[PDB]
Amino acid sequence: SHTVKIYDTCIGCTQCVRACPTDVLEMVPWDGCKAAQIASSPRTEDCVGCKRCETACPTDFLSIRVYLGAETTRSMGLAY
């Protein structure tokens, strides 16, 4: 499966979670930013690697990073 990592520069804008087409991410309570929330990736098994989350992330550099790893049936997005 791919690896999704969230760094401490996250501002809790929830855009990466909204952009994810397979619900890999969620918003969890945090204290490092004003929004008092941070992105999390509990379901990286469902990550296809589309990198829509990185596109949605407004920080510089990215607060969320996707590293493509071992390919499974659901990571290749195969309906067969």
């Binding site: 690896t3 990592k5 087409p21 918003m27 008092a36 999390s40 990073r65 067969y80």
Partner: protein, 139 residues
């Protein structure tokens, strides 16, 4: 078991395949206030019933797209659930995981795969040679 009536659909070529019976399948269930036409994730138009609808799908992305871009955004339906069904009959509700949609912060959710530094402080791969750890996984 998952209960609900399948939407009116005359058949299509983008439905389930051998993977549904061999490895896994997904089921999206929802409730609509009226009978209305929606778009199937893999082409064609179907008609969701008045009551409670259940639709079988090949991938979780199909259910996420249908629930988000059509049910919530277009039909104002917010009670859809996506279950993963295995060939042995085991069914687990995977979306939303804890009953609250992921984009809304919910108490009790732990931080998963969080790195306590900025992305520019990842160590060089030369430091981690032959150790098997990636720079983003380094402490």
């Amino acid at each position: 078991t998952l209960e609900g009536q399948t939407p009116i659909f005359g058949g299509g070529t983008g439905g389930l395949l051998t993977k549904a019976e061999r490895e896994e399948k997904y089921v999206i269930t929802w409730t609509s206030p009226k009978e209305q036409v929606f778009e199937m994730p893999t082409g064609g138009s179907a008609i969701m019933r008045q009551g409670k609808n259940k639709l079988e799908i090949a991938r979780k992305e199909y259910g996420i797209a249908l629930g988000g871009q059509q049910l919530r955004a277009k039909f104002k339906i917010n009670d859809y659930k996506i279950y993963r069904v295995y060939p042995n009959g085991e069914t687990q509700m995977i979306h939303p995981a804890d009953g609250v949609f992921p984009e809304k912060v919910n108490q009790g959710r732990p931080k998963v795969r969080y790195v306590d530094r900025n992305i520019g402080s990842n160590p060089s791969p030369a430091k981690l040679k032959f150790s098997g750890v990636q720079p983003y996984d380094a402490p």
